[PDB]
Structure formats: C-alpha cells, structure tokens
Amino acid sequence: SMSYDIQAWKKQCEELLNLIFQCEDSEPFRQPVDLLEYPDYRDIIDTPMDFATVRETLEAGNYESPMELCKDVRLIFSNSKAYTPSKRSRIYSMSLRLSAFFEEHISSVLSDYKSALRFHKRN
C-alpha cells in the first residue's frame, strides 16, 4: 500500500498547486487570458493554459500521471515566453522565478512516481 503508492502523486500535486496559488509570482497565470481584453493572444498562442485549468483538470481526474500535469504546467511557461519574450519585462522575470519554483518541487513527485511504476512492473 503506502510505499510505492501509484496514486500518492495526486495529493502531492494538489499541495504543490496550493503553494503556486499563494505565490505572488503566479498572479498573471492563475486564470485564462481574457481573449476579449487581449484580442491578439490567440494570434500568438495555439493552446492557452493556466493554473486554475490545471487544478480543475486534476480535481476532475483527467490526468493519468503527474507527467501529464507537468506537461500542462510547462505549457503555461512556454506560452508566457512566447507572448512576453523580452528579458527586460518584469512579467518575464516572474515567469522564470515561478517556473524554477515549480521545477524544483515537481522533481521528487515525478521521481517517486516513476520508481513506483518500475517496482510494480518488476513484480
């Protein structure tokens, strides 16, 4: 049961998203971009993504693994680099800080999940 629990990642990701929502650096990324108030957003960005959407996808049970959740979170940050590419921008700096924060904390979630998969496959 608890060692190598292949479902433990879900609550760990719920907790990491709570930390992200607390971060002042997440303010621009908490909700979808208003496509009326930024009419050129979709001219640039193919697939919008934001932390409320990630949080709801997880709650609905629509991620099969923490790697699928990580892919959507990384899309938030690649979308930000595409839409706000200037390294002079304070929004660029916020995006980089929050991405480093997410990458640090998701690392062990992924590592542990993959170790658990390997153990159950072996046995």
Ligand X SMILES: CC(C)Cc1nc(C#N)c(N)o1
Q: What is the nearest approach in angstroms of ligand X to the Cβ of residue 34?
A: 8
Q: In this complex, which beta carbon is closest to ligand X, that of residue 27 or of residue 56?
A: 27
Q: In this complex, which beta carbon is closest to ligand X, that of residue 78 or of residue 84?
A: 84
DSSP count for the chain of H helices, then E strands? 5, 0
Q: In this complex, which beta carbon is closest to ligand X, that of residue 15 or of residue 27?
A: 27
Length of the chain, please? Answer: 123
Token pair of 101, please?
Answer: 């924060």
Q: Which residues bind ligand X (CB under 6 A)?
A: 28, 33, 38, 83-84, 89, 91
Q: In this complex, which beta carbon is closest to ligand X, that of residue 50 or of residue 66?
A: 50
Q: What is the nearest approach in angstroms of ligand X to the Cβ of residue 96?
A: 13
Q: What is the nearest approach in angstroms of ligand X to the Cβ of residue 6?
A: 36
Q: What is the nearest approach in angstroms of ligand X to the Cβ of residue 80?
A: 7
Give one DSSP letter per residue of 14-33, joined into a string. HHHHHHHHHSGGGGGGSS--
CB count, 10 Å around CB of 107?
11
* C-alpha to C-alpha distance for 120 and 116, rounded to whole angstroms: 6
**Contact assessment for residue 35 and residue 42, using Cβ atoms and an 8 Å cutoff:** yes
**Tokens 């480093």 correspond to what residue?**
100
